Ligand binder design. Structure first.
Ligand code: FAD
Length: 383
């Protein structure tokens, strides 16, 4: 039986479920409230500069999942790109994550790796028996100068919270690498789509069995015209925020164009509270195989997600999870729908993890047909 599917969202979740289902002969209808596909992974070429701009902030592709890597290479030319981050703080510029250079530079030293391990040990705060706080976990690990330089002000700006208000759980391991490797990400596969994520997702959507409708908001009544709905929209929004809004940080991006080269790297973090933006991204650096005279940059600002804002980073502490549980027990009562994705499940997910879950979701749904069985509302655990 060729099933009639509605998908709410044209991001990775929607596109990847859609395409898997379309290929098995189902009639997939994808809608998006935005005037463009891609969801938050969307990029577009600035008309004045011709720079590929990542519209909703830097998107760097990285995965240890070979299946997912193979999948993206089917839909794009993946360019070798290894993300490297600088941070400005204390009137100095450092490598991130904290590594041997960061240390040697920070302390005006020349430590070998083993010498640096001793320094971090004799810099770690030897007091709080059982650290209960992110502040004290950090202090135990790296000590005061580094906690303050690299962690304190960044948390306050990014989360609108004191690190003393967060649990020790946030920092499981010593955040230092005892060599000169300055790759930000440890993933096996790391690349950048030559022609961008939007072209990649356009290719993913490129199937006879998929109809895309843009500038179209979901309306609950439509539900009855379909065999099943896959919903990648905000879970609380689906229920009209009847219990209250789920906690999110929003981001404002202030766009500006520079002639030449504004910062000389893709991403520069500003760890200080004395800098109101959190980082500056210079988009042309995500495409090193291109040359651009002009440069589009974003100053990035973190903020509480008020009602009109794009939700970005989920807060997810005790009271948020408490409020989620209310939606979850409404949702787990629903009959012909599956909530997926960063918003439908209130988790932060990377692109590769999105595609992974999206492939599995479709696999689960397809199986449920052959084996004539009910399709679950969640294919991944949410609590
Ligand atoms: C600031 C930031 C930076 C990121 N950078 C990286 C990175 O560098 N590397 C990485 O791996 N991942 C990155 N990500 C994660 C990446 O953005 C997500 O994995 C990806 O967006 C997941 O897409 P999705 O399809 O699951 O959901 P989304 O991309 O949010 O797509 C959902 C779509 O649904 C639409 N929609 C919602 N509600 C409705 C409705 N009611 N009706 C119609 N349409 C609706 C929205 O318009 C949207 O287009 C980043 C995330 C953030 C917040």
């Amino acid at each position: 039986k060729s099933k009639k599917i509605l998908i709410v969202g044209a991001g990775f979740s929607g596109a990847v479920i859609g395409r898997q289902l379309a290929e098995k002969g189902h009639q997939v209808h994808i809608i998006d409230q935005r005037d463009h596909i891609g969801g938050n992974s969307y990029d577009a070429r600035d008309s004045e500069t011709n720079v590929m701009v990542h519209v909703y902030g830097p998107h760097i592709f990285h995965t240890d999942n070979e299946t997912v890597w193979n999948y993206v290479n089917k839909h794009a030319e993946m360019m070798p790109y290894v993300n490297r981050v600088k941070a400005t703080v204390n009137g100095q510029v450092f490598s991130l994550p904290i590594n041997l250079h960061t240390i040697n530079q920070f302390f005006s030293k020349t430590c070998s790796p083993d010498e640096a391990r001793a320094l971090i040990a004799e810099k770690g705060d030897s007091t709080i028996a059982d650290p209960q706080t992110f502040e004290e976990e950090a202090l135990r690990f790296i000590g005061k100068e580094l906690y303050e330089a690299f962690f304190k002000g960044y948390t306050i700006k990014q989360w609108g919270m004191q690190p003393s208000e967060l649990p020790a759980s946030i920092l499981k391991r010593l955040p230092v690498r005892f060599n000169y490797d300055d790759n930000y990400f440890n993933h096996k596969f790391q690349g950048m789509p030559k022609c961008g994520y939007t072209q990649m997702i356009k290719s993913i959507l490129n199937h006879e069995n998929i109809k895309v409708d843009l500038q179209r908001e979901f309306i609950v009544e439509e539900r009855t015209h379909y065999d099943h709905v896959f919903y990648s929209g905000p879970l609380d929004a689906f229920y009209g925020y009847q219990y209250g809004r789920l906690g999110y940080r929003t981001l404002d991006f202030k766009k500006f164009t520079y002639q030449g080269d504004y910062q000389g790297c893709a991403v520069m973090n500003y760890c200080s509270v004395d800098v109101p933006y959190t980082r500056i991204t210079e988009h042309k650096y995500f495409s090193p195989w291109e040359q651009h005279d002009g440069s589009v940059c974003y100053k990035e600002y973190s903020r509480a997600c008020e009602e009109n804002d794009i939700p970005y980073y989920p807060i997810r502490q005790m009271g948020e999870m408490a409020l989620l549980e209310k939606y979850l027990s409404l949702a787990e009562n629903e009959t012909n729908i599956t909530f997926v994705g960063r918003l439908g499940t209130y988790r932060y997910l990377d692109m590769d993890v999105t595609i992974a879950e999206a492939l599995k979701t479709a696999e689960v749904y397809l199986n449920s047909l052959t084996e004539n069985q009910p399709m679950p509302v969640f294919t991944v655990s949410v609590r």
